[PDB]
Amino acid sequence: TIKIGAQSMSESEIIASMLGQLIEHHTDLKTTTIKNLGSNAVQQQALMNGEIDIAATRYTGTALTGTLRMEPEKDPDKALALTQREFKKRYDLKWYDSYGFDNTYAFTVSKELADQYHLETVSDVKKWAPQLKLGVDNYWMKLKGNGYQDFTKTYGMTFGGTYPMQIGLVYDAVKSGKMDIVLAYSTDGRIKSYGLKMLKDDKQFFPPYDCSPVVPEKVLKEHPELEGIIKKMLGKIDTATMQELNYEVDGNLKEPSVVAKEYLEKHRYFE
Ligand SMILES: C[N+](C)(C)CCO
């Protein structure tokens, strides 16, 4: 049984299920999803100690800072190449090419607020920060490198209130007016239909967050059919599509496994 890890995000559950279903489509391997992994670090340790055989969704900027403790790299291609090289060298892990989407932190407001105050960039809210309530996920306040501490230092603003909550809640928090601004994830499917506006990170504080599966080389050697199966997903899932899939779960109330199955059927399992 191939154990596929998912972080506590709809996106990760969808992709983990899709990869599992694709493996079962092509082979006699059983698969199962190890859900609710809390973070990049949890995924990393689980890969290294055999608790998961595949990490469905890891993100380059997160791993480059968090796991590798390297200086950030602004260019997506260079960041991916560095991550791939160092993951193989340091951990004998294969960090695959991206599925085709990046999922970045994005400061997000209602279009109404953006229109009223001409907000386009993160710097545009600097003068307003003391009068804004910011909603954020339950990790970002303690997060190192690109978390709240470095953000305040780089952008030189502090919000009037900061409210950590489970990430899935921030979208209706800002839509309903409870928060004025939230640190959303750019692939969330609610951003569009909730009429939200992502502000440009004009200081380039956030690194690239291209998403890939990661697998130990030992697992690939023992299951030589996995490489060609994983490859079928790479470069095929763009950000707009990921947003649509996430929406099916969070807005259309479908199970991630059903969303994955329906996508595979629509796209004929990528062949
Ligand atoms: C996907 N993000 C980079 C937004 C968070 C990962 O924990």
Swiss-Prot record:
One of its GO terms (cellular component) is ATP-binding cassette (ABC) transporter complex. Its main location: membrane. Changing K218Q: In strain: ATCC 6633. GO terms for molecular function: transmembrane transporter activity. Pfam families: OpuAC (PF04069). It comes from the Bacteria. Changing D77E: In strain: ATCC 6633. The keyword Transcription does not apply. It is found in: Cell membrane. This is Choline-binding protein. The gene is opuBC.
